[PDB]
Amino acid sequence: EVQLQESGPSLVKPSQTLSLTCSVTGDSVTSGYWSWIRQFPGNKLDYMGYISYRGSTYYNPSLKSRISITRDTSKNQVYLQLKSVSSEDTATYYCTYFDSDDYAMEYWGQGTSVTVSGGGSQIVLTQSPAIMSASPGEKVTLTCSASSSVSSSHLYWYQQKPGSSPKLWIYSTSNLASGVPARFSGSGSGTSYSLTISSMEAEDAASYFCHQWSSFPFTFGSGTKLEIK
Numbered sequence: 740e741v742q743l744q745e746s747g748p749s750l751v752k753p754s755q756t757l758s759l760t761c762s763v764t765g766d767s768v769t770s771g772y773w774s775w776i777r778q779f780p781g782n783k784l785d786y787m788g789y790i791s792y793r794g795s796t797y798y799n800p801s802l803k804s805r806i807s808i809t810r811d812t813s814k815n816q817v818y819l820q821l822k823s824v825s826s827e828d829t830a831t832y833y834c835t836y837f838d839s840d841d842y843a844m845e846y847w848g849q850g851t852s853v854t855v856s857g858g859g860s861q862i863v864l865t866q867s868p869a870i871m872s873a874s875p876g877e878k879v880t881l882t883c884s885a886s887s888s889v890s891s892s893h894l895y896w897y898q899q900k901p902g903s904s905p906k907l908w909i910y911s912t913s914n915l916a917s918g919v920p921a922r923f924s925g926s927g928s929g930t931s932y933s934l935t936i937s938s939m940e941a942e943d944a945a946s947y948f949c950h951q952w953s954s955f956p957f958t959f960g961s962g963t964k965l966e967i968k
């Protein structure tokens with residue numbers, strides 16, 4: 740019901756400015772946040788910042804002073820500007836929409852790839868093993884250990900398959916999002932969380948990322964790639 744689409748140059752020279760546009764289409768909204776999230780090669784996700792429905796912004800401390808997120812509401816667009824890029828800014832950039840009156844839904848654009856030729860603190864989310872293979876029919880358990888405590892309402896899981904964006908999979912530790920087979924489950928508390936498939940199917944092979952938005956900047960685990968034997 741909200742579609743999102745990112746565009747801008749696929750290549751940028753060091754020290755230049757990167758400018759992307761997120762085109763919002765679909766139903767009108769009365770609240771929420773448009774966030775820019777990027778994914779590095781090797782798949783680490785990085786929360787950049789948001790602009791709210793009231794035009795309030797939050798920027799990852801790591802980017803502050805380089806980043807700005809703006810809106811052209813007449814054009815239903817949201818913009819990202821990041822100045823003084825380096826090869827460290829090479830990634831696929833996604834814009835996303837979320838409304839905290841509803842924890843169960845989050846919308847992601849298709850994502851656009853960009854290649855380049857503060858002071859703060861963050862919760863680190865650890866997912867081990869990085870890669871795992873299971874046979875069809877096995878009960879599978881993936882874990883997420885947070886370096887500091889996280890509210891269980893704000894611990895979330897995402898599935899992603901090659902060539903496509905992360906999809907909201909579990910929200911608030913244990914609730915399956917729309918689209919998710921009920922063979923999935925999640926539990927945990929404090930700094931220790933797990934996702935479970937009662938019975939592994941071929942379609943479950945994918946990367947899974949955990950995510951907390953209990954503390955600012957929100958962070959993602961580096962994922963477990965789940966393969967089929």
Ligand SMILES: CN[C@@H](C)Cc1ccccc1
Binds near residue numbers: 774839845957
């Ligand atoms: C659950 N994923 C979070 C990034 C959604 C979000 C965005 C902005 C503000 C609050 C919450």
